[PDB]
Design an enzyme around this catalytic site. Structure first.
Site, short mmCIF file in Angstrom:
data_model
loop_
_atom_site.label_atom_id
_atom_site.label_comp_id
_atom_site.label_asym_id
_atom_site.label_seq_id
_atom_site.Cartn_x
_atom_site.Cartn_y
_atom_site.Cartn_z
N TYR A 509 0.87 -1.18 0.00
CA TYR A 509 0.00 0.00 0.00
C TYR A 509 0.91 1.23 0.00
O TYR A 509 1.02 1.92 -1.02
CB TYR A 509 -1.02 0.01 1.16
CG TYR A 509 -1.99 1.16 1.04
CD1 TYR A 509 -2.96 1.18 0.04
CD2 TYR A 509 -1.89 2.25 1.89
CE1 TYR A 509 -3.82 2.24 -0.10
CE2 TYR A 509 -2.76 3.32 1.76
CZ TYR A 509 -3.72 3.31 0.77
OH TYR A 509 -4.58 4.38 0.65
N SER A 592 -5.19 0.82 -5.08
CA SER A 592 -5.34 2.23 -4.71
C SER A 592 -3.96 2.92 -4.70
O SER A 592 -3.30 2.94 -5.74
CB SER A 592 -6.05 2.33 -3.36
OG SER A 592 -6.58 3.62 -3.17
N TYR A 593 -3.53 3.48 -3.56
CA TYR A 593 -2.16 3.99 -3.44
C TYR A 593 -1.16 2.88 -3.75
O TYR A 593 -0.10 3.15 -4.34
CB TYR A 593 -1.89 4.56 -2.05
CG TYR A 593 -0.72 5.53 -2.02
CD1 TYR A 593 0.61 5.08 -2.09
CD2 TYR A 593 -0.94 6.91 -1.95
CE1 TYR A 593 1.68 5.95 -2.08
CE2 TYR A 593 0.15 7.82 -1.94
CZ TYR A 593 1.45 7.33 -2.00
OH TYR A 593 2.53 8.19 -1.99
N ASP A 670 -15.61 3.99 -10.90
CA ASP A 670 -14.78 4.46 -9.80
C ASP A 670 -14.85 6.00 -9.73
O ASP A 670 -14.32 6.71 -10.61
CB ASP A 670 -13.37 3.94 -10.02
CG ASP A 670 -12.50 4.06 -8.81
OD1 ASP A 670 -12.63 5.02 -8.02
OD2 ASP A 670 -11.64 3.18 -8.68
N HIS A 702 -14.38 1.94 -6.62
CA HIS A 702 -13.04 1.77 -6.08
C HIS A 702 -12.83 0.52 -5.25
O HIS A 702 -11.69 0.00 -5.15
CB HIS A 702 -12.62 3.01 -5.28
CG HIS A 702 -11.14 3.11 -5.10
ND1 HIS A 702 -10.27 3.12 -6.18
CD2 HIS A 702 -10.37 3.18 -3.99
CE1 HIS A 702 -9.03 3.20 -5.73
NE2 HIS A 702 -9.06 3.23 -4.41
C1 LIG Z 1 -7.62 5.18 5.31
C2 LIG Z 1 -7.23 6.65 5.53
C3 LIG Z 1 -7.34 6.97 6.96
N1 LIG Z 1 -6.76 6.33 8.02
C4 LIG Z 1 -7.19 7.04 9.08
C5 LIG Z 1 -6.75 6.67 10.48
F1 LIG Z 1 -5.47 7.01 10.66
F2 LIG Z 1 -7.53 7.34 11.33
F3 LIG Z 1 -6.87 5.36 10.64
N2 LIG Z 1 -7.99 8.11 8.81
N3 LIG Z 1 -8.04 8.00 7.42
C6 LIG Z 1 -8.83 8.95 6.64
C7 LIG Z 1 -9.21 8.20 5.36
N4 LIG Z 1 -8.01 7.61 4.72
C8 LIG Z 1 -7.56 7.87 3.48
O1 LIG Z 1 -6.41 7.59 3.16
C9 LIG Z 1 -8.48 8.52 2.45
C10 LIG Z 1 -7.97 8.39 1.00
N5 LIG Z 1 -8.88 9.08 0.10
C11 LIG Z 1 -7.86 6.92 0.60
C12 LIG Z 1 -7.29 6.77 -0.79
C13 LIG Z 1 -5.96 7.13 -1.03
C14 LIG Z 1 -5.45 7.00 -2.32
F4 LIG Z 1 -4.19 7.35 -2.62
C15 LIG Z 1 -6.29 6.48 -3.41
F5 LIG Z 1 -5.69 6.38 -4.60
C16 LIG Z 1 -7.61 6.09 -3.19
C17 LIG Z 1 -8.13 6.22 -1.90
F6 LIG Z 1 -9.41 5.87 -1.67
#
Ligand SMILES: C[C@@H]1c2nc(C(F)(F)F)nn2CCN1C(=O)C[C@H](N)Cc1cc(F)c(F)cc1F
Ligand SMILES: C[C@@H]1c2nc(C(F)(F)F)nn2CCN1C(=O)C[C@H](N)Cc1cc(F)c(F)cc1F
Ligand SMILES: *[C@@H]1O[C@H](CO)[C@@H](O[C@@H]2O[C@H](CO)[C@@H](O)[C@H](O)[C@H]2NC(C)=O)[C@H](O)[C@H]1NC(C)=O
Ligand SMILES: *[C@@H]1O[C@H](CO)[C@@H](O[C@@H]2O[C@H](CO)[C@@H](O)[C@H](O)[C@H]2NC(C)=O)[C@H](O)[C@H]1NC(C)=O
Ligand SMILES: *[C@@H]1O[C@H](CO)[C@@H](O[C@@H]2O[C@H](CO)[C@@H](O)[C@H](O)[C@H]2NC(C)=O)[C@H](O)[C@H]1NC(C)=O
Ligand SMILES: *[C@@H]1O[C@H](CO)[C@@H](O[C@@H]2O[C@H](CO)[C@@H](O)[C@H](O)[C@H]2NC(C)=O)[C@H](O)[C@H]1NC(C)=O
Ligand SMILES: *[C@@H]1O[C@H](CO)[C@@H](O[C@@H]2O[C@H](CO)[C@@H](O)[C@H](O)[C@H]2NC(C)=O)[C@H](O)[C@H]1NC(C)=O
Ligand SMILES: *[C@@H]1O[C@H](CO)[C@@H](O[C@@H]2O[C@H](CO)[C@@H](O)[C@H](O)[C@H]2NC(C)=O)[C@H](O)[C@H]1NC(C)=O
Ligand SMILES: *[C@@H]1O[C@H](CO)[C@@H](O[C@@H]2O[C@H](CO)[C@@H](O)[C@H](O)[C@H]2NC(C)=O)[C@H](O)[C@H]1NC(C)=O
Ligand SMILES: *[C@@H]1O[C@H](CO)[C@@H](O[C@H]2O[C@H](CO)[C@@H](O)[C@H](O)[C@H]2NC(C)=O)[C@H](O)[C@H]1NC(C)=O
Ligand SMILES: *[C@@H]1O[C@H](CO)[C@@H](O[C@H]2O[C@H](CO)[C@@H](O)[C@H](O)[C@H]2NC(C)=O)[C@H](O)[C@H]1NC(C)=O
Ligand SMILES: *[C@@H]1O[C@H](CO)[C@@H](O)[C@H](O)[C@H]1NC(C)=O
Ligand SMILES: *[C@@H]1O[C@H](CO)[C@@H](O)[C@H](O)[C@H]1NC(C)=O
Ligand SMILES: *[C@@H]1O[C@H](CO)[C@@H](O)[C@H](O)[C@H]1NC(C)=O
Ligand SMILES: *[C@@H]1O[C@H](CO)[C@@H](O)[C@H](O)[C@H]1NC(C)=O
Ligand code: NA
Lengths: 728, 728
Positions: A509, A592-593, A670, A702
């Protein structure tokens, strides 16, 4: 010879993890669904009664998706006609059932296509959003009061988030906040008038002759963002005035100078609310603390109560500035912030003093604050055994910070190293949820003496099942790079032999503040690959990964597509040096990432990886949304960071994909990582004459999570990996 | 040991067919571009002169796409800034060069983004369309007269066709018809107001942040169709002061009762025009013959000059009612129509007589009328040796129909069995173009005694190159099904050994009136497959195929996805029983209609095919356009043919794909067969748990013809086929 854990086992869920999902309804009672009956449990003694019999809604005429009991236990909210939207958003129909009269309410019904509904935190008031406007019902059978008149589909959102605030800021559709006793209702309003739309086709059932174009206000990196306003209405005045005034709380002057966000709303008392604002350049945040003024009916935020949180090395917070936890009187609060060493710890503030006092410290991090009583603060951290990927519950004495008790560490240390917690309403009881490294274990505890009350669910049924299966093992450990520990895990095949060479799949990831090496027990695709196919499935937490301090987390600041990519490659080199890995059979995959990182690694020219799979990858940072992307990358302008935006695309590496086998997969619907991102990868590869494998998933988003598509994608990927590794 | 014809040879055009594309400018002379110089040739003697030197436009500033010399030779129209739209449509910029004063005209220039332009047939008037309106220039240096004012993007089309009329009716963007001496300009106007739009994403270059949505008025089967009107304007009485008057010619009452099309416009004389109209139910067409009334300035179409053409077995015409060929006085005409046996032959009509006289007859068909003098009519037919896949030029004596002379049959019977022809202005000379079974051969002839004047191009350079390549051969033969012969061809590997078992690929089109078994020489993907990979590539013409009478062609009337699919399976079944075919290695592929048939075959459960490839297939007739689909299927309504629309889909056969290997390929910007069609196939296969191979081509249309995408698609399919056949 015992059977292995197979692809069918995974895809059909033959080996099922049991959960224990309870809902606290008071300080000593919880609801639990057993055999579609809703039971109410006394926490102290473990005895139960039927709260709502399974047969109650036989003649309802609809499948009930979920339910919600009013805080006073007088009414239950029944959710049906559930229609998913994005990650958290959906619409539904709602009926209210009167629990005392045992009658369904048939007048002044919550309308169809309702976007959000919530009880007040006390009593049985309801607030809901319908056609982008807020409504309040004081009583379930009585007419609604309309709160807003500006709601406009795709334009003005009152009490609900737009696409980007839902995904990147609030992790919720809801943008409404009842005050603790329900007198006030606070809400945000989002204005997307000048936000550009992403447009894509949705094909639907084959009966649809013309495809539908889905159009969503979605700001890409550097694009026009939504604007936001904040209001508080007094719901107690609704039945007294024709049209109750929503009082605005304006952002501070330091936010109003440019683009900004509302990033946190937390009530402190009946008449005190806190708000956190974030600049579009996400290294500067301001908390206002605002008091109701009885004689003016306004809300005022004294500058003496305003708190600045900034970062010199990165962005503020892990994904956003952390929430405050106020003491009962609302005169002080606890908050996780990065200390001088870059480690996230609990700081204690008086509302009108700017310097806080750190109450925890060390080279580990507080994950979250879980409960606050007058005597104790309860929090989850990765302190135990210096393991960033473990989690435990701690209790700190508020009158003496040297008194810190680990509540979960030594309960079952072999089986249980990753905990979350669920406290009753006034923290009199807590449920502990152990999720690994052994089978999940759910237990109930009393806070008065921290004694274990009883085991709720120990997964003995599954344990019995898994005895007849050749299950893989998990190694969690670290390698040392530049005098820094970097953690990895390996899912190892049954009867693992150190003197043999195994094919290795790197599961990636690697996004900012991510953690892929941990103590969680999982039954997944990696389980099958290790158990049946004798593949080592590895994951690695390099620069940019979370819960290890800012030196590691902020290493990729303004530089996505660099160190986190390089460190995956280096991890694979290190795994080769270990002597049980076939260097000719190293693969990499991510979603995703992880799809972005996988593609960056496969296009690096490293020679390390034979093949790889990217699922729904980002390919160019300018295609992804503003809030997430700009947090780590800044703005894509010549003055700011455009050169790195343009330098960190998958497409620029197209020529290097001649050295590898690549499978590119994307859902056509998506809304998050647009199909566009993979359309651009494939075009770049076609343009340089590179052969690869592709798969689109019609109308999948997605998550590619519909039952048939989930099975299809994992089947498709299994064939590809097996082909690459020359596995029969 | 000499080389084989490789995949690179096909993709890089190593072996080029030479052409001889001439343009007749009179009864005695033609233009031919040689070394970027335009030469004029005397047909009788073969002497030439330079008409225009290459270097005349050395400092033009633009790359010239094409040229058009005015009929009087005074002017040359220079086409540049070409931008493709659909199959025939494009826009371009235009300049006019005066050949006598050796100068570019700089006054009153044709505008940029011009949609269509044409010289009058005589002299040097111009009609052009810009922004959907018609304009006329009497002299290249003079101001244009605006003919129409109603032009409106995607709504009103003056003198140009909309999407469906371009693709399915006229096979041209132009809807302008000059009278034989340029006095009058006839034109059609299309109204697409209520036609639904197909919408799809176009991703463009990487730099485009948000994809673009393309919206095209496109009527799918059963949807609201464009309406049509027809006008004639006098270009000799235009005025600078007054707007031009266009005289409308309305459709016959038998057409006005419901939906209908304009399907043919043909000038008979200076003052007489013929139009054919077609009902939306395309088994009834009406020809009007209209005369200019000099005293009233009106065009009158006498009811006594109406000619009805209908069909009881299918639709009218091959793809539409055929064009009439009027005599010099325009009092009578010749037209190919289906006779009482259902074979297409030339009928002779008087303008005001109902009964026509067939001048040809037999169990073969006239392909086209090519030239007409007072003594002879010249036509192409497949009569010779009773071979439906051969083509030869004939003349018939108009005063004695028993006197039919084949002009091409015996010229070179071993090399040349497939001809087309180009006659000079008054049919004094003709160019014959042989395209197979040997290398193309271009010859010039004089009509008076059918002297073979000279060889223009014999492809002897190619012949010499091909001597050092192991080229495949072609077998053309027939099999019998229910006492009927159906023809097939096989591309056979070099050194073919009938005691060896070869894998077989069935190359399929099989649309109504198609022909895939013929005597044409081709260098294509099949050449490589046979020459290098030792694969037999077969094609078969079953029920629904053309040029063999209506009993065969109309067998699939109202019934697509039935007999033509069955006959492909039956042909393969028969091939599989031949001694030289490996029944374990039979594959099928096709593009467009052939992609549909390939998919229907692979979903048939026959068990004959191991694998197959469908490129841009139709999957459900309701997704394809009205004009083509309804021709063969009628309307998708319960009162008409809905049940068969619903049971002839690929999606309904999804479960039967479990035992085949399937590669599904589609361009995302296909405006013809919408990506939708393949998107619905993949979803159906996912829904029943069937694994398959997929490839999308970003921004490619129905041709997938961009240089890089063309190389990529054939590379990918080659791997698929070789994998399927266990070939290294
Ligand atoms: C899972 C992560 C997250 N982890 C947490 C934590 F730390 F509270 F657990 N809060 N959040 C807020 C939401 N999070 C995100 O990364 C949102 C992000 N849009 C996810 C994402 C990243 C990408 F690079 C991508 F390409 C597609 C995605 F859906
Ligand atoms: C090539 C054919 C044709 N052949 C002829 C003939 F007889 F003159 F050669 N006239 N036309 C008129 C135009 N023709 C068509 O079939 C148009 C048609 N839309 C082609 C087509 C058919 C399909 F089923 C499809 F899926 C996609 C297509 F592009
Ligand atoms: C669990 O058991 C307790 C204690 O027995 C129940 O509480 C009360 O019990 C006494 C008699 O033993 C009576 O006053 C009532 O019958 C009970 N009152 C309440 C609180 O309901 C309790 O009901 C039980 N809890 C559940 C959910 O069944
Ligand atoms: C949402 O924001 C837009 C700004 O983009 C506001 O629209 C403008 O409103 C003013 C009236 O004050 C008009 O004169 C402008 O023409 C509008 N501009 C645009 C781009 O339409 C809109 O008022 C805001 N809506 C709410 C409810 O706050
Ligand atoms: C309740 O009060 C609000 C706020 O005063 C009203 O909203 C305004 O409505 C008027 C006219 O319809 C507009 O000119 C303003 O731009 C609106 N302002 C806001 C904040 O939305 C609302 O219409 C009132 N509702 C009723 C029933 O009177
Ligand atoms: C919930 O809190 C609100 C806000 O403090 C209470 O409303 C106030 O009640 C006090 C009486 O103690 C009055 O002096 C004020 O006029 C009220 N203020 C407002 C803004 O309404 C409310 O009474 C509390 N609710 C309950 C049921 O305890
Ligand atoms: C078609 O485009 C050309 C080129 O743009 C026009 O000629 C001029 O081009 C220069 C730049 O190439 C511009 O500065 C001018 O605006 C253009 N106009 C003129 C009159 O000089 C040409 O005019 C265009 N033709 C039409 C019919 O608009
Ligand atoms: C082309 O044909 C038209 C139509 O027949 C000719 O126009 C006519 O010319 C004669 C003069 O001899 C007049 O009597 C008529 O009034 C004209 N009719 C119309 C419809 O305008 C025209 O002369 C021919 N043009 C050329 C270049 O040969
Ligand atoms: C042209 O075709 C249509 C449709 O086949 C014929 O109209 C009738 O319509 C329905 C089928 O949709 C049936 O009741 C009949 O079979 C059709 N007519 C008959 C044969 O009675 C129509 O007749 C055809 N027209 C011509 C000129 O033959
Ligand atoms: C081909 O040959 C003829 C005759 O040899 C050429 O000569 C004719 O035309 C010329 C002017 O265009 C003149 O030389 C004569 O008028 C005329 N001569 C004859 C044969 O009567 C003719 O130009 C040549 N054609 C081309 C296209 O070059
Ligand atoms: C193109 O066709 C439309 C009909 O599709 C014409 O507009 C007509 O249809 C409208 C309904 O959409 C009616 O409200 C109008 O009354 C009707 N107009 C007429 C003249 O009947 C439109 O005019 C057509 N355009 C042209 C230039 O022919
Ligand atoms: C409630 O209904 C379910 C049916 O899903 C049944 O199995 C269960 O036994 C019922 N509850 C009780 C206590 O019998
Ligand atoms: C919701 O929709 C159904 C079906 O159209 C309708 O009968 C019902 O009255 C609706 N409910 C409300 C609260 O409007
Ligand atoms: C925020 O980031 C920008 C870009 O790195 C920088 O110039 C600025 O100094 C930062 N602000 C703070 C508070 O560090
Ligand atoms: C011609 O028609 C158009 C539109 O109907 C009008 O605007 C224009 O002025 C007319 N010209 C003359 C000279 O009548
Ligand atoms: Na000769």
């Amino acid at each position: 010879t015992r059977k292995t854990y197979t692809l069918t086992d995974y895809l059909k869920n033959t080996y099922r993890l049991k959960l224990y999902s309870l809902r606290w309804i008071s300080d000593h009672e919880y609801l639990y669904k057993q055999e579609n009956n809703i039971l109410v449990f006394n926490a102290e003694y473990g005895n139960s009664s039927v709260f709502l019999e399974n047969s109650t809604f036989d003649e309802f005429g609809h499948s009930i998706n979920d339910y919600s009991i009013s805080p006073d236990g007088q009414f239950i909210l029944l959710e049906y006609n559930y229609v998913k939207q994005w990650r958290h958003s959906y619409t539904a129909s709602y009926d209210i059932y009167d629990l005392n009269k045992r009658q369904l309410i048939t007048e002044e019904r919550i309308p169809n296509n309702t976007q959000w509904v919530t009880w007040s935190p006390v009593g049985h008031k309801l607030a809901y959003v319908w056609n982008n406007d807020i409504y309040v019902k004081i009583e379930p059978n009585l007419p609604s009061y309309r709160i807003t008149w500006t709601g406009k589909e795709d334009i003005i959102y009152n009490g609900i988030t737009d696409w980007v605030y839902e995904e990147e800021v609030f992790s919720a559709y809801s943008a409404l906040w009842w005050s603790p006793n329900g007198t006030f209702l606070a809400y945000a309003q989002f204005n997307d008038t000048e936000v550009p739309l992403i447009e894509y086709s949705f094909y639907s059932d084959e009966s649809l002759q013309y495809p539908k174009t889905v159009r969503v206000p979605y700001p890409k990196a550097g694009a026009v963002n939504p604007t936001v306003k904040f209001f508080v209405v007094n719901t107690d005045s609704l039945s007294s005035v024709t049209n109750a005034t929503s009082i605005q709380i304006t952002a501070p002057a330091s936010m109003l100078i440019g683009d900004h966000y509302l990033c946190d709303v937390t009530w402190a008392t009946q008449e005190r609310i806190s708000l956190q604002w974030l600049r579009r350049i996400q290294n500067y945040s301001v908390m206002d603390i605002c008091d109701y003024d009885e004689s003016s009916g306004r809300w005022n935020c004294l500058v003496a109560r305003q708190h600045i949180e900034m970062s010199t090395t990165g962005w503020v917070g892990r994904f956003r500035p952390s929430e405050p936890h106020f003491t009962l009187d609302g005169n002080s609060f606890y908050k996780i912030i990065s200390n001088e060493e870059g480690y996230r710890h609990i700081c204690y503030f008086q509302i009108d003093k700017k310097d806080c006092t750190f109450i925890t410290k060390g080279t580990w991090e507080v994950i979250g604050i879980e409960a606050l009583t007058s005597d104790y603060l309860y929090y989850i951290s990765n302190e135990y055994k210096g393991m960033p990927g473990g989690r435990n519950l701690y209790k700190i004495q508020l009158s003496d910070y040297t008194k810190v008790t680990c509540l979960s560490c030594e309960l079952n240390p072999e089986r249980c190293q990753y905990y979350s917690v669920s406290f009753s309403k006034e923290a009199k009881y807590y449920q502990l949820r152990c999720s690994g490294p052994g089978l999940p274990l759910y237990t109930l505890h009393s806070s008065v003496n921290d004694k274990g009350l009883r085991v709720l669910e120990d997964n003995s049924a599954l344990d019995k099942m898994l005895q007849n299966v050749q299950m893989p093992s998990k190694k969690l450990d670290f390698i040392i790079l530049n005098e820094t520990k970097f953690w990895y895990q390996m899912i190892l095949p049954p009867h693992f032999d150190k003197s043999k060479k195994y094919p290795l799949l790197l599961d990636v990831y690697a996004g900012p503040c991510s953690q892929k090496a941990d103590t969680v027990f999982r039954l997944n695709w990696a389980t099958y690959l290790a158990s049946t196919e004798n593949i080592i499935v590895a994951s690695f937490d390099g620069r940019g990964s979370g819960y290890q301090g800012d030196k590691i987390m902020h290493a990729i600041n303004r530089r996505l597509g660099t160190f986190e990519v390089e460190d995956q490659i280096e991890a694979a080199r290190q795994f080769s040096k270990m002597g049980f890995v076939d260097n000719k059979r190293i693969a990499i995959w991510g979603w995703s990432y992880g799809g972005y990182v996988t593609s960056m690694v496969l296009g690096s020219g490293s020679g390390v990886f034979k093949c790889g799979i990217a699922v729904a990858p980002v390919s160019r940072w300018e295609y992804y949304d503003s809030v997430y992307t700009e947090r780590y990358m800044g703005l894509p302008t010549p003055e700011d960071n455009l050169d790195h935006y343009r330098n960190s695309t998958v497409m620029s590496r197209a020529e290097n994909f001649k050295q590898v086998e690549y499978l590119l997969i994307h859902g056509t619907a998506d809304d998050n990582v647009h199909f566009q991102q993979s359309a651009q990868i494939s075009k770049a590869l076609v343009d340089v004459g590179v052969d690869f494998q592709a798969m689109w998933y019609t109308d999948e988003d997605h998550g590619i999570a519909s039952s048939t598509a989930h099975q299809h994608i994992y089947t498709h990927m299994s064939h590809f990996i097996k082909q690459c590794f020359s596995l029969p």
